[PDB]
RNA sequence: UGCGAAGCUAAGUCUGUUGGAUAAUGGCUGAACGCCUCUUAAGCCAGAAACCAUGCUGAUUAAACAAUACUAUCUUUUUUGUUUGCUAAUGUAAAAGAGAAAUUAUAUAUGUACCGGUACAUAAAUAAUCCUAUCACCUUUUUCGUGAGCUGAGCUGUGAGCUAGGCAAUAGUUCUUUAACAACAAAAAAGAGCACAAACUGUAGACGACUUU
RNA sequence: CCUUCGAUGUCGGCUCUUCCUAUCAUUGGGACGCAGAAGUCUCAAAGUGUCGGAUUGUUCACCCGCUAAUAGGGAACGUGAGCUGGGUUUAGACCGUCGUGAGACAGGUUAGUUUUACCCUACUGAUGAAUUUUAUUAUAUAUAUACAUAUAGUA
RNA sequence: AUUUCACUCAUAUUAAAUAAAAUAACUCCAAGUGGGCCAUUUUUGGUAAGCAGAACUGGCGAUGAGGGAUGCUCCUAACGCUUGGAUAAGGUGCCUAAAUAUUCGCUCAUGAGAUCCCAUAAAAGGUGUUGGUUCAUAUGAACUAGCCCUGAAAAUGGAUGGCGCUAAAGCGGA
RNA sequence: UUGUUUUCACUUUCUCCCCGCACUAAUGUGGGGAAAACUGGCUUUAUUUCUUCAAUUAUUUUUUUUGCUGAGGA
């Protein structure tokens, strides 16, 4: 018969299966729709979760209980050393999805980049990317011309530089950032002129801008149904324990439905949060990265004693309003809205 | 099931027509109209030197025969629209809140304000080949003109239906925009 | 199906097996008529272990003769060969299993000079 | 039926009739390739067929929809599923017959350059009275969630251009070959001439 | 007993889109039915927390796939064959000309020439069609096209043909017409690095697995 | 009285999921005996939500209160190897009525053992090979090819 | 009434027809059985029931085979082992052997319809379309009955058997 | 309480006349009139190989190409 008292289900079915993510790296499921009118521009960036702090800001919300008063807000610091652009990949639409036409590499790639192709770099001969890079420029131009003629989606391969971060990891995180903007003629030249130089965060993002964050949540191993789905604890008198779901289905269908909460893995899930506002883009060069015009002190973003479990942020960073999924040192991919 | 049924439509003087595979094209001093009738089984015999076009259907059951006069009336509407633009005079009626109509975008995309004092802009875009302006004689009148009867009439209907009132007695709150009359230029 | 060599037609091969003997070890394949109540085979449901009938009987003109088109006769010594002297072309001889190599050679040679074929001629040598 | 494979153009073909003919051919061990599957027609209004597909879509196994009827949205896959339903696919021979069929949307690289056949027994122009509603499988799939209709149209117009160029070249070659023939036909012996024109060559 | 970092944690903090096509309904043009009619004909419009997309999560859910980087004695033709557990070696769901690329409309189409229109051709049992097969050999006279090598150009070979000549088939009446494709083995000729483990890590964890050095 | 008496654990609550629509609220409409407000009838619609307590074992019920609304139902009267055991429904005992009595009560009351998963499947998570009679939305300097293409490892 | 003598009443087809009618009749010994159930038709109780109780015959039981997708009882038809032929019931778009057969009408369904048992549908309606009947100067009416539509709402996801089918692969014929 | 008889009305035109006079689906047409007589029908004479001699039934005689089977041993 019907339930005596209705109440909404536990957890969202939209994040199923709650299994471990394939990779530690956040993967963009989709990039923002291409706008032809805007000039060519990058769309995503990569950084590392250094920790978080709090800031004070003056609110300018008329008709609000806060308005002119000053407010403390939590903010996440994501260390973003400049990314290095190393490749171009062209996509073309087919009724079977997007098809790669080809990828064109730069004339030189970092050892940090090449490390990503190795599981045992220390014992390897490091022969990757050694003789495919001296290809004649004529074939390069031919491949770019074919990409211009046939492709309709352009992405630039770019990688991080963990050597500029306190990470123990040495192999670079590499990912493709889609170029959104003018026609392919302009996209190709826009990426070609940047085919080897560093890509700073300030080029991709501006302050006071809303961005999305893609990252893998903090892992917790296998967790019970109470923690994993928030089901209610059974009364203290329950015979074989109380930390479980009492009825896991009616008699019929004579199966267990997939909508029933069960024990299993919790955390280490891929997540894509929207609308995180950039509060400040702090630069490596300046000594007043953490100073405001109302503070005029000489200080950098790293708190005294260092960011716990991370280290010191000696590079560019962005102060993100709110929290972001993942532990410290977790790679966070920032995506344009 | 009748064997053959025909009906004749005279071609007015200032119009030039062209019919191929029941795809009619009508040209006049007020533009060009283009209609397709490929959803009906018909022969369209176009006579040019003696004007007129005859729509003939073979083996027509009454349900299909009903469409002969529909096609003929569509053709004559095309003629009249291309020789003298169809005009729809609309009236803006209001009880207490005068309706502020503003015509922008070279006589397209009319905007309506102050409907029941809502101070929220409503707007409708005229269908292709349709011109909206305001009457120079009566202050609360709107002219919706064009060659295509369906287009101009649909634009007038869009204007009328964009300004319906909700949650009130419809028979007491009479204000809105209504097609006062339909004529030609 | 039927097997037909010469005039001898064998109306059925692949001897009948007991119902369920394939999937029970305690049930030997030797045919037993199933009594049952709802027995499938007894009711003659299609596609299940048809039962032997008299209709499968081979014709009596060629019933008991071997592929050599003659009847077999099992002998234990040379004395039981005497009746074969008259019908040596209607009977073949098979030596009994418990006959020694002493006597098997004697029976083989006697059948040879008697002009009667031996079935298991090359046994125990 | 007796060719290595039959390439058939599905444009303007009724889905069920086409599937039945294809299934019989496949069961008789004939390999077929169906192209332009997004132009298949279906009798009945577009709204009616959309309602039918929504009823199909509402149908999944309650316990675990992964196991449920995989719905599919490409018109090629829809035609493939219709043929499978018209076929004993749960046997070995039926599975072979099903796998002997290839379905495409548009005309890809091998099949745009070979002769496409048509089944007149399943053509809409011959099987539907002109006053009765029909649907287009491509638009139905688009309304259901295929979202690749326009790209197939683009590829199709491009293929139309290249086919037009090929056809013009072929027509010129045939004209020049006919001109060669009509003159070389005067150089053969007169009795050979008589035989050729008697039998119409 | 106080305090209690770190780590977990909520009672704390942050974040939680817009498009298409529709239903009800209201309408447009408009016959049936000289009028009228939202269509209870044809042809259209606007339209909902619903539907489908977008976005998000998986994708050993597709026994799926692509591009890239590097590498394993390896890679191309001919002959003979595949008639201690092994160390030569064979399989076909379909060869017998398995021949055939325009597009489209179905109360019409297609090509060409001008500026969707005009004009003219073409097609309208369309595969009920067209195309492709047998002229062996060798010798003579020769004609015309393509490959190697040579310097737009000469020669050799190849393909097709021309004139003239003689030159073969035979296994007793058929038992599949051993004729296809792909692969493999042997022998000849030519060219041609990684991963696991280990120690470490702890962004991970029941164990595997995962992140690292 | 059709199946189950060599046993399908028979009330309620708690927990948890899903489904129906005969829609309570929310979305957009039509009608009104519709001025506005409030409301009533009704259509498309199941996306979202339908509560805290006092008394009673209760379902049902009835009050207090919040709410936007506190809609109706199904899933072996969903759900006991999920719990609980208050009731019912063994054996102890008390009362009332009935019986000569042993005892009876669809009368009341109190106390009264709630067993097993390590199997298959399902579900939740976690490793993981193998995959050619297999696959192909191309590959080739405005140009041919399926009579083709594709070895394998790591990443 | 009995008995005995006479005469004689078709029989060559046989005191009407037809009859694998003596496969009869009789006697003895004995097994199992003595819970039945279903269908057509009839019928009692009951609001009704896959309910309870009866009558006739045929079946199921005790019995498979072809068909009805599926099914103890429906249709065809009852059974030794085979080879050919031809059919019954039922079918011939594919599943699936055989007609995308021929010929004539009807039907468009924003929950069409599609083989006895059989797997529900009614009163009441329709200015949907098709064909008839009777009244009024090619019109207005009133009827009528075919298909279609409303009436027509339930719980895991779902079933003319499935796919699907509309110049039917639907309905009624030939 | 049956027969019998009588009347008009029945056809083709690539014919003509008038009206609309191009109005048609139309290489024609609508309405109203005339005409004979090809067309159609009938009556005679000759023929049925120019052509037809059908269909059904009864009663008979063959024929093309082929599937399966060969019991027995007087």
TrEMBL record, chain A:
One of its GO terms (molecular function) is structural constituent of ribosome. Belongs to the universal ribosomal protein uL3 family. PANTHER family: 60S RIBOSOMAL PROTEIN L3-RELATED (PTHR11363), LARGE RIBOSOMAL SUBUNIT PROTEIN UL3 (PTHR11363:SF5). GO terms for cellular component: cytosolic large ribosomal subunit. This is 60S ribosomal protein L3. Pfam families: Ribosomal_L3. Keywords: Metal-binding, Ribonucleoprotein, Ribosomal protein. The keyword Ribosomal protein applies. One of its GO terms (biological process) is translation.
Automatic annotation (TrEMBL), chain B:
Transmembrane segments: none annotated. One of its GO terms (cellular component) is large ribosomal subunit. One of its GO terms (molecular function) is rRNA binding. It comes from the Eukaryota. Residues 11-84, 110-176 form the Large ribosomal subunit protein uL6 alpha-beta domain. Keywords: Ribonucleoprotein, Ribosomal protein. GO terms for biological process: cytoplasmic translation; translation. Pfam families: Ribosomal_L6. InterPro entries: Ribosomal_uL6-like (IPR000702), Ribosomal_uL6-like_a/b-dom_sf (IPR036789), Ribosomal_uL6_a/b-dom (IPR020040). Belongs to the universal ribosomal protein uL6 family. This is 60S ribosomal protein L6, putative. It comes from Plasmodium falciparum (isolate 3D7).
From TrEMBL, chain C:
CDD domains: Ribosomal_L32_L32e. This is 60S ribosomal protein L32. The keyword Ribosomal protein applies. It comes from Plasmodium falciparum (isolate 3D7). It comes from the Eukaryota. The keyword Ribosomal protein applies. GO terms for molecular function: structural constituent of ribosome. Keywords: Ribonucleoprotein, Ribosomal protein. InterPro entries: Ribosomal_eL32, Ribosomal_eL32_CS, Ribosomal_eL32_sf. PROSITE patterns: RIBOSOMAL_L32E. One of its GO terms (biological process) is translation. It holds the Pfam family Ribosomal_L32e. One of its GO terms (cellular component) is cytosolic large ribosomal subunit. Belongs to the eukaryotic ribosomal protein eL32 family.
Automatic annotation (TrEMBL), chain D:
One of its GO terms (cellular component) is ribosome. Pfam families: Ribosomal_L13. GO terms for molecular function: mRNA binding; structural constituent of ribosome. GO terms for biological process: negative regulation of translation; translation. InterPro entries: Ribosomal_uL13 (IPR005822), Ribosomal_uL13_euk/arc (IPR005755), Ribosomal_uL13_sf (IPR036899). Belongs to the universal ribosomal protein uL13 family. This is 60S ribosomal protein L13, putative.
């Amino acid at each position: 018969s019907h339930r005596k008292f209705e109440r909404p289900r536990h957890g969202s079915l939209g994040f199923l299966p709650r299994k471990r993510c394939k990779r530690l790296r956040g993967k963009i499921r989709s990039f923002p729709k291409d706008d032809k009118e805007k000039p060519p521009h990058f769309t995503a960036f990569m950084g590392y979760k250094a920790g978080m702090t709090h800031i004070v800001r003056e609110v300018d919300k008329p008709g609000s209980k806060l308005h002119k008063k000053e407010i403390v807000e939590a903010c996440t610091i994501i260390e973003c050393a400049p990314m290095v652009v190393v490749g171009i990949v062209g996509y073309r639409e087919t009724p079977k999805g997007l098809r790669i036409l080809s990828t064109v590499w730069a004339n030189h790639v970092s050892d940090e980049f090449r490390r990503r192709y190795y599981k045992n770099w220390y014992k390897s001969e490091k022969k990757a990317f050694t003789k495919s890079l001296n290809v004649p420029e004529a074939t390069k131009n031919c491949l770019l011309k074919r990409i211009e003629k046939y492709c309709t989606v352009l992405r630039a391969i770019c990688h991080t530089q963990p050597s500029k971060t306190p990470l123990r990891m040495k192999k670079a995180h590499i990912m493709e950032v889609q170029i959104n903007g003018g026609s392919m003629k302009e996209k190709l030249e826009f990426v070609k002129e940047m085919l080897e130089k560093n890509l700073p965060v300030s080029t991709v993002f501006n302050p006071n801008e809303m961005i999305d964050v893609i990252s893998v949540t903090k892992g917790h191993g296998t967790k019970g149904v109470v923690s994993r789905y928030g089901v209610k604890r059974l009364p203290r008198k329950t015979h074989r324990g109380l930390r479980k779901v009492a009825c896991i289905g009616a008699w019929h269908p004579a199966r267990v439905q997939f909508q029933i909460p069960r024990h299993g893995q919790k955390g280490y899930f891929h997540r894509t949060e929207r609308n995180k506002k950039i509060y400040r883009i702090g630069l490596k060069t300046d000594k007043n990265s953490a100073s405001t015009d109302a503070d005029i002190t000489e200080k950098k973003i790293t708190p005294m004693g260092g960011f716990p479990h991370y280290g010191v942020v000696n590079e560019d960073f962005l102060l993100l309003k709110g929290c972001v999924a993942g532990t410290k040192k977790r790679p966070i991919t920032l995506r344009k809205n | 099931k009748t064997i053959v049924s025909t009906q004749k439509v005279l071609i007015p003087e200032g119009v030039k027509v062209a019919i191929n595979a029941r795809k009619v094209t009508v040209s006049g001093k007020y533009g060009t109209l283009r209609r397709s009738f490929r959803h009906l089984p018909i022969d369209i015999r176009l006579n040019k030197l003696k004007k007129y076009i005859k729509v003939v259907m073979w083996f027509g059951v009454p349900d299909s025969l009903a469409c002969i006069r529909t096609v003929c009336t569509h053709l004559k509407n095309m003629f009249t629209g291309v020789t003298k633009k169809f005009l729809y005079k609309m009236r803006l009626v209001h009880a207490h809140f005068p309706i502020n109509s503003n015509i922008v975008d070279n006589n397209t995309r009319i905007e309506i304000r102050n409907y029941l004092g809502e101070k929220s802009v409503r707007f409708v875009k005229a269908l292709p080949g349709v011109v909206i302006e305001k009457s120079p004689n009566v202050k609360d009148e709107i002219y919706v003109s064009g060659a295509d009867i369906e287009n101009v009439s649909l634009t007038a209907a869009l204007i009328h239906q964009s300004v319906l009132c909700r949650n009130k007695d419809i028979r007491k709150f009479l204000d809105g925009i209504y097609v006062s009359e339909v004529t030609t230029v | 199906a039927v097997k037909k060599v010469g005039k001898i037609i064998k109306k059925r091969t692949k001897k009948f097996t007991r119902f369920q003997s394939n999937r029970f070890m305690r049930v030997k394949p030797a045919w037993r008529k199933p009594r049952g109540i709802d027995c499938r085979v007894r009711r003659r449901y299609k596609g299940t272990n048809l039962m032997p009938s008299i209709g499968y009987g081979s014709n009596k003109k060629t019933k008991f003769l071997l592929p050599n088109n003659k009847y077999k006769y099992v002998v234990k010594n040379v004395k039981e060969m005497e009746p074969l002297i008259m019908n040596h072309t209607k009977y073949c001889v098979q030596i009994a299993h418990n006959v020694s190599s002493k006597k098997r050679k004697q029976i083989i040679e006697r059948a040879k000079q008697m002009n009667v074929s031996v079935i298991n001629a090359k046994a125990r040598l | 039926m007796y060719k290595k494979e039959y390439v058939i153009d599905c444009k303007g073909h009724l889905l069920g009739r086409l599937a039945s003919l294809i299934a019989k051919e496949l069961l008789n061990g004939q390999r077929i390739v169906a192209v332009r599957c997004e132009d298949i027609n279906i009798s009945g209004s577009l709204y009616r067929n959309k309602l039918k597909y929504q009823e199909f879509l509402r149908l999944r196994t309650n316990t675990n929809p992964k196991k449920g009827p995989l719905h599919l949205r490409e018109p090629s896959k829809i035609l493939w599923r219709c043929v499978r339903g018209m076929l004993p696919h749960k046997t070995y021979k039926g599975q072979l017959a099903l796998k002997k069929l290839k379905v495409c949307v548009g005309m890809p690289y091998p099949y745009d350059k070979k002769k496409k056949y048509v089944l007149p027994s399943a053509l809409r122009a011959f099987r539907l009275k002109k006053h009765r509603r029909y649907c287009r499988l491509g638009t139905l799939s688009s309304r259901v969630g295929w979202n690749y209709d326009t790209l197939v149209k683009k590829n199709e117009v491009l293929r139309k251009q290249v086919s037009k160029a090929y056809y013009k070249k072929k027509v010129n070659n045939l004209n020049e070959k006919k001109e060669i023939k009509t003159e070389a036909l005067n150089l053969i012996n007169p009795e050979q001439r008589q035989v050729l024109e008697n039998f119409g060559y």
